[PDB]
């Protein structure tokens, strides 16, 4: 059946994972102990759908996910928290030492000694599946585990399973904000290895979500929880067509056919427009014409790039709730009338649509309002080429002086792995310039 395996890698992936599983349990009615009271309420009904959880005879619902870190700190809070009786206790920790912001320690040195145990549970998870779709990988660029461990895992999964969707949900690096001096290296080296092996890579930046939580929700002291709780809704919109019913279903194997023209240009963005507080939930109609326009304005992107400096190639639009299709056709007509939103000449259509009837669920203790309708937008632009240059320009400076390279060489790397990885990203800058060129014949 329609099945997906989630893999949470490093601190960001695991914390975002926590957020995601607190949201998956409430939509379906699973208590944190893994039980369902609906088993007593109505007999013979699927609410804890088999796409995200496996069932037992005792009426438990155990999630199809694997968390891995290299340090026991972040995953020791799942064993000592509310959701301790939900996950299979084989939550992979390689405690010993983490990657400490080094790609090499997460690839070979400390990255090994735990990957075989990771793929064994990934086999036990897939063998339980009656025909699976793909894998959801949640990690961050910049950290030593989120980059290295993921790049190693992605390459093995490319041999074992092969023709399966490998979708990534990654935290891309901000241009100004940062929490490390080695995010450029750990990004450029992850790209060189997770580009021939990924199928689609959804990007989010922390700076883009801070400005939303300030402007849209009136929060001037936001934390990582108020940040992960939007990332939960974005994954829920993607994963709703497998769980809940709707008119136009959109499975996971459709994205990579919709949003990836070429096999190297598969770096789309994300945005979730109706980010509203309870006070501004009123004074608002919250119609499709407002939301869809809100998904195309730069002040509501979850990545800090101005799409008016580029051209859209493709755009998926996944609606949730009370939504009639005509209200989508008219909205897309309006968006196509405008001259700011500019498309390539080789894609007049440039719109995939999906609709699902189940509206979102409001988490208790949240900053999001209850909504009759919600929308996501997974777009592919050339404006990303103006971010990959920045991360490259930083790479151009430090590597000129060979700073923070002793630490990589010291854990099984070469000087030539940087030049080979930096030359692969200078080609991905030329491709995004080719796709934007006017065609002729």
């Amino acid at each position: 059946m329609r099945e997906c395996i989630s893999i949470h890698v490093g601190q960001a992936g695991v914390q975002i994972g926590n957020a995601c599983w607190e949201l998956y349990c409430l939509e379906h009615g699973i208590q944190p102990d893994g039980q369902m009271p609906s088993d007593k309420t109505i007999g013979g009904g699927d609410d804890s759908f088999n796409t995200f959880f496996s069932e037992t005879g005792a009426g438990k619902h155990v999630p199809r996910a694997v968390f891995v870190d290299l340090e026991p700190t972040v995953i020791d809070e799942v064993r000592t928290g509310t959701y301790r009786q939900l996950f299979h206790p084989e939550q992979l920790i390689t405690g010993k030492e983490d990657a400490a912001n080094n790609y090499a320690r997460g690839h070979y040195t400390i990255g090994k000694e735990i990957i075989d145990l990771v793929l064994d549970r990934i086999r036990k998870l897939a063998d339980q599946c009656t025909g699976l779709q793909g894998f959801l990988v949640f990690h961050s660029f910049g950290g030593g585990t989120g980059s290295g461990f993921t790049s190693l895992l992605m390459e093995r999964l490319s041999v074992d399973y092969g023709k399966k969707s490998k979708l990534e949900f990654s935290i891309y690096p901000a241009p100004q904000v940062s929490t490390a001096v080695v995010e450029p290296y750990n990004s450029i080296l992850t790209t060189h290895t997770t580009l021939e092996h990924s199928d689609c890579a959804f990007m989010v930046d922390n700076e883009a979500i801070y400005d939303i939580c300030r402007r849209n929700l009136d929060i001037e002291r936001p934390t990582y929880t108020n940040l992960n709780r939007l990332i939960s809704q974005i994954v829920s919109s993607i994963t709703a067509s497998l769980r809940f019913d709707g008119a136009l279903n959109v499975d996971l194997t459709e994205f990579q056919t919709n949003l990836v023209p070429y096999p190297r240009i598969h770096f789309p963005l994300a945005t979730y427009a109706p980010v509203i507080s309870a006070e501004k939930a009123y004074h608002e109609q919250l119609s499709v014409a407002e939301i869809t326009n809100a998904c195309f304005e730069p002040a509501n992107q979850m990545v800090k790039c101005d799409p008016r400096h580029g051209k859209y190639m493709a755009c998926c639009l996944l609606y949730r709730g009370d939504v009639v299709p005509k209200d989508v056709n008219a909205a897309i007509a309006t968006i196509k009338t405008k001259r700011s939103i500019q498309f390539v000449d080789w894609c007049p259509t440039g719109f995939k649509v999906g609709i699902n009837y189940q509206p979102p669920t409001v988490v208790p203790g949240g900053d999001l309002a209850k909504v009759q309708r919600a929308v996501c937008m997974l777009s592919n632009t050339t404006a990303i080429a103006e971010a990959w240059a920045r991360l490259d320009h930083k790479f151009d400076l430090m590597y000129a002086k060979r700073a923070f390279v002793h630490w990589y060489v010291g854990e099984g790397m070469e000087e030539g792995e940087f030049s080979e990885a930096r030359e692969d990203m200078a080609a991905l800058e030329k491709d995004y310039e080719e796709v934007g060129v006017d065609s002729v014949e």
Partner: protein, 346 residues
């Protein structure tokens, strides 16, 4: 004030691979060396100070051992008699042509023989009784940032690799404490000593080859020149010394692919760290050539620290990169070329 000279050499196809039908990957338009493979949309170019095309005998730019010497190593003996020091590095990977361009063969001799013979046979035309010449010779290795003498015989007991210490003399410069320095009269003595040394040099088996070098080997020649000039009395009133270092380096050894564990990995990391320091020092000498106040990181690796007085100041430094033209060896050749580029980025 100091001039670095990078030269890059391409070997011809092996007999083992001229029949196996390997696909040529490196080309040249005379000046620049280009790397191309049909699979790739991209082709990388590399311009060096000197390219020694040794692929096809019928080329108008063929480079035999008589050319790699006359173009690179011969201007280093012309400078040693002026009283200044010289360094000559040999970089490559296993199968590139390093030991063939450096030492050579029974009847096709590399740089060491054509240099020593052109030394001893060039002082015997200026060896008066007024001017004299004395030659001494040392030969050591760096293994995991630890100096070892190779011309010392082992015994009948456990580990016989005795580590020595590198000290800093205030006037002259750094030196190894306890190193056997031997006196030489001909080329045959150097040949015997080197043949005695390269059997003690560290070697391990890896996927690349049966015998891969795991140490930076350093061969030194100290030349003294005593002149007698009249100062109204007895005349011994002159001696200027010159140092000639010829060094065979190890390879990078991508530890990602070769799934290394233990001492090899350890060794690998050591060699990778020394090559990173050496590269930086070589690229800091080139900035001075143009002109800029800059600081050389000599005391970051032992090899660049022992050769401080042969790398900077009024000193000449040469570097021979070797690369294979086969398509099986394309990540190694590219790393070699990228490493040679940063040396000379003038």
């Amino acid at each position: 004030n100091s001039q670095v000279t990078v030269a890059v050499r391409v070997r011809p196809f092996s007999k083992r691979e001229k029949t196996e039908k390997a696909s040529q990957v490196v080309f040249t338009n005379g000046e620049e060396i280009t790397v191309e493979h049909p699979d790739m949309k991209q082709v990388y170019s590399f311009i060096y100070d000197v390219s020694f095309w040794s692929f096809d005998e019928c080329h108008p730019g063929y480079a035999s051992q008589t050319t790699v010497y006359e173009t690179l190593a011969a201007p280093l003996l012309d400078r040693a008699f002026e009283g200044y020091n010289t360094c000559l590095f040999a970089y490559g990977q296993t199968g590139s042509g390093k030991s063939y361009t450096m030492m050579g063969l029974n009847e096709e001799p590399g740089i060491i023989p054509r240099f020593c013979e052109d030394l001893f046979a060039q002082i015997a035309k200026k060896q008066t009784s007024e001017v004299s010449y004395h030659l001494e010779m040392s030969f050591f290795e760096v293994y995991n940032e630890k100096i070892h003498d190779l011309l010392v015989c082992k015994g009948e007991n456990g580990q016989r690799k005795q580590p020595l210490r590198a000290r800093e003399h205030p006037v002259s410069g750094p030196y190894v404490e306890g190193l056997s320095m031997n006196v030489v009269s001909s080329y045959s003595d150097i040949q015997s000593w080197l043949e005695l040394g390269n059997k003690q040099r560290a070697t391990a088996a890896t996927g690349m080859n049966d015998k891969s070098s795991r140490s930076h080997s350093v061969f030194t020649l100290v030349m003294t020149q005593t002149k007698t000039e009249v100062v109204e009395g007895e005349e011994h009133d002159h001696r200027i010394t010159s140092r000639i270092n010829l060094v065979d380096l190890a390879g990078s050894e991508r530890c990602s692919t070769a799934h290394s564990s233990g001492q090899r990995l350890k060794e690998g990391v050591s060699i990778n760290k020394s090559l990173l320091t050496l590269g930086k020092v070589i690229s800091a000498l080139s900035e001075q050539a143009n002109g800029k106040r800059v600081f050389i990181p000599y005391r970051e690796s032992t090899l660049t620290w022992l050769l401080k007085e042969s790398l900077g100041g009024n000193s000449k430094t040469a570097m021979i990169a070797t690369v294979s033209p086969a398509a099986s060896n394309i990540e190694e050749t590219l790393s070699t070329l990228r490493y040679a580029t940063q040396a000379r980025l003038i």
